[PDB]
Amino acid sequence: SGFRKMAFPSGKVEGCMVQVTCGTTTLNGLWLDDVVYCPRHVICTSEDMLNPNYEDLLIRKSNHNFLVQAGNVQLRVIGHSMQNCVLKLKVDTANPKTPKYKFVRIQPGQTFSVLACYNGSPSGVYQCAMRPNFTIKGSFLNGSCGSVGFNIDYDCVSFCYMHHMELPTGVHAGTDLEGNFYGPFVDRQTAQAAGTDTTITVNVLAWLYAAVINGDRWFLNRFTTTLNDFNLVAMKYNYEPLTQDHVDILGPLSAQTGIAVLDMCASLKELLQNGMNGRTILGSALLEDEFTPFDVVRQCSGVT
Amino acid sequence: SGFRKMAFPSGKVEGCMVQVTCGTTTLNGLWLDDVVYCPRHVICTSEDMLNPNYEDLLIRKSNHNFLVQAGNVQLRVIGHSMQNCVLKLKVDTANPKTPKYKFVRIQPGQTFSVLACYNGSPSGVYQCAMRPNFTIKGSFLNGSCGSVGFNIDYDCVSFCYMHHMELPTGVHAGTDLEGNFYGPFVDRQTAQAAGTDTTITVNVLAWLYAAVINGDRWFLNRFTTTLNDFNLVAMKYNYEPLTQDHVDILGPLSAQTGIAVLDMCASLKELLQNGMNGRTILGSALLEDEFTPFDVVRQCSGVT
Numbered sequence: 312s313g314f315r316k317m318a319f320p321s322g323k324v325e326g327c328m329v330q331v332t333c334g335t336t337t338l339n340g341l342w343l344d345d346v347v348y349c350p351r352h353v354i355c356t357s358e359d360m361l362n363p364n365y366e367d368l369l370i371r372k373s374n375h376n377f378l379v380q381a382g383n384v385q386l387r388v389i390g391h392s393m394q395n396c397v398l399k400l401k402v403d404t405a406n407p408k409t410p411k412y413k414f415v416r417i418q419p420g421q422t423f424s425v426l427a428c429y430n431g432s433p434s435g436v437y438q439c440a441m442r443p444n445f446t447i448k449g450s451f452l453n454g455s456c457g458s459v460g461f462n463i464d465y466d467c468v469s470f471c472y473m474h475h476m477e478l479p480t481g482v483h484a485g486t487d488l489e490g491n492f493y494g495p496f497v498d499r500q501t502a503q504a505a506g507t508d509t510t511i512t513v514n515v516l517a518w519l520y521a522a523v524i525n526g527d528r529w530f531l532n533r534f535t536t537t538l539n540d541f542n543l544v545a546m547k548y549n550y551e552p553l554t555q556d557h558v559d560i561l562g563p564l565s566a567q568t569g570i571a572v573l574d575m576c577a578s579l580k581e582l583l584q585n586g587m588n589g590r591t592i593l594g595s596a597l598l599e600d601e602f603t604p605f606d607v608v609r610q611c612s613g614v615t
Numbered sequence: 616s617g618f619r620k621m622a623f624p625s626g627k628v629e630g631c632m633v634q635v636t637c638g639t640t641t642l643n644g645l646w647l648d649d650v651v652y653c654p655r656h657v658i659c660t661s662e663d664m665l666n667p668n669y670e671d672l673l674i675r676k677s678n679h680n681f682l683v684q685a686g687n688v689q690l691r692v693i694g695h696s697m698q699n700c701v702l703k704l705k706v707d708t709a710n711p712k713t714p715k716y717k718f719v720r721i722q723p724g725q726t727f728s729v730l731a732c733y734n735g736s737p738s739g740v741y742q743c744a745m746r747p748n749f750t751i752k753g754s755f756l757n758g759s760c761g762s763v764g765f766n767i768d769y770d771c772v773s774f775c776y777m778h779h780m781e782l783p784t785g786v787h788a789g790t791d792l793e794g795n796f797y798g799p800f801v802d803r804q805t806a807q808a809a810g811t812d813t814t815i816t817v818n819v820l821a822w823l824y825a826a827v828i829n830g831d832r833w834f835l836n837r838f839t840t841t842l843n844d845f846n847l848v849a850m851k852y853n854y855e856p857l858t859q860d861h862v863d864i865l866g867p868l869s870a871q872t873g874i875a876v877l878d879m880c881a882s883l884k885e886l887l888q889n890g891m892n893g894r895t896i897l898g899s900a901l902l903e904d905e906f907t908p909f910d911v912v913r914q915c916s917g918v919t
């Protein structure tokens with residue numbers, strides 16, 4: 312009973328958080344095995360961020376300029392390299408708390424947990440999604456850079472995000488763990504605007520299935536629709552077009568509830584056209600799109 | 616930038632989760648030092664839950680009947696006692712991962728994180744609040760009993776909740792770590808109804824302050840009100856009466872934003888009377904009441 316925006320337990324990631332300082336700049340790093348990963352803008356001053364030439368700024372840095380502190384102990388830096396927008400600092404000690412891990416580059420619409428950190432110390436954990444415009448709506452302040460996003464499959468942590476910057480609109484941009492930005496963003500203090508923040512339709516449908524499973528059924532109607540008809544409505548409301556791949560992923564939720572995917576689409580169509588009329592679904596007064604079909608199955612089954 | 620429903624990092628609590636089995640019943644326990652805490656209904660069968668006499672059911676249980684497994688290793692049970700609605704199982708090994716901890720009994724309106732577990736294994740973490748009717752709106756399935764709620768002050772974990780049951784309405788009831796239920800609930804499979812779920816006014820005001828800090832300012836108006844005038848409106852909308860104690864706790868948010876508490880009350884009054892008119896505040900289409908003033912200060916300052 313009940314349905315909450317749930318994050319993965321963060322212990323495995325907390326054991327990886329370190330502080331990296333280079334000059335006067337301090338941010339977070341991720342220590343896995345004998346490598347510390349962090350945003351390359353750790354080498355920049357505030358003046359440097361306007362138009363940084365990272366290769367040139369890195370020439371003036373040596374291993375001893377990167378101060379890496381794990382809790383209260385100093386790690387010895389024996390190598391450093393830049394991979395895209397991340398720095399990889401080779402340290403002389405493998406992290407004893409390194410979990411089983413993978414680096415994955417996620418797709419827009421996919422959700423993950425973020426362990427927000429400051430000075431190598433965790434402050435909180437929350438769940439969010441890679442928006443279709445490749446931004447994330449997080450909660451990050453100055454010093455949170457290097458905080459990571461991840462998913463967990465039993466014992467394996469799949470790292471998918473490293474926080475780099477806030478856009479002038481207060482939305483967030485970052486990279487995968489190979490240092491490649493999600494979307495078109497660059498690690499420079501230049502105004503970069505985000506595209507249309509469309510709604511992740513397959514996630515809204517999954518959340519409607521979670522609502523039915525939990526007793527919120529008022530929105531179920533006597534209608535059905537087709538993918539093409541549904542998609543005309545989706546376009547009108549800045550919703551992602553629904554494909555047969557999305558219908559397929561909703562199959563287990565359709566099977567569990569006995570509500571055909573296209574019938575749930577017709578319920579969603581009426582909600583788009585008519586609004587909620589002052590009513591709520593799973594305690595929300597808007598259509599939630601940051602639960603994937605996998606998240607709904609996981610939460611509704613009790614996977615650990 | 617950004618404001619999210621953030622839970623505390625759960626690592627310190629994950630290191631305390633164990634599985635307790637008694638007969639055919641398995642639930643979660645909390646292992647701190649050489650004691651494992653768990654709901655006393657672990658000794659019950661499904662037949663026993665209709666009208667259990669816990670003292671009598673406990674006479675037929677010995678130390679060896681409580682199977683406690685920490686990850687994949689068995690703990691030796693050398694003592695057992697019942698304190699209110701919890702069992703305390705003395706084990707022969709102190710938990711090496713025991714964090715600095717306290718047991719606190721929270722007040723309605725206070726928020727905390729829950730580490731939902733199944734079979735001693737963490738599945739997720741979410742933030743919630745003790746409702747004014749002493750229920751919590753969680754996400755718990757069969758086997759989640761013994762999952763705990765907590766807050767963290769730097770290195771000290773303050774345990775405040777242990778999950779025991781779901782009401783027939785899908786809301787949740789549990790105890791503090793001394794085994795005393797929050798509210799009037801009893802650990803028995805008898806239909807128990809929850810009282811009025813009123814809105815935590817001081818939390819809604821704190822969340823309005825977080826909204827102003829983050830740029831969502833449309834709801835600020837040219838009005839002010841008094842505590843008594845505000846409270847007539849609060850009563851009409853099933854909001855908790857606001858007291859001078861609540862105004863005092865909002866002082867730092869008032870000081871940071873320059874918006875007097877009673878002016879924020881007048882903005883809240885207009886939102887109650889007029890609704891949001893299809894608009895959102897911090898991505899929500901309703902007034903959020905599960906952030907305390909302390910949570911807002913903490914999140915907006917970056918406390919680790």
Ligand SMILES: Cc1ccncc1NC(=O)C1(c2cccc(Cl)c2)CC(=O)C1
Pocket residue numbers: 352360451452453454455456475476477478497498499500501616
């Ligand atoms: C202030 C803040 C809040 C939330 N999330 C991140 C930041 N930091 C930034 O955005 C900064 C930055 C500026 C341009 C490019 C890049 Cl890569 C980084 C300005 C710094 O200091 C780093």
Ligand SMILES: Cc1ccncc1NC(=O)C1(c2cccc(Cl)c2)CC(=O)C1
Pocket residue numbers: 312656664755756757758759760779780781782801802803804805
């Ligand atoms: C099924 C579920 C979902 C979420 N949270 C808890 C539960 N479990 C219960 O409520 C059960 C129960 C019943 C009456 C009293 C008490 Cl103390 C416990 C029925 C069990 O099995 C334990």
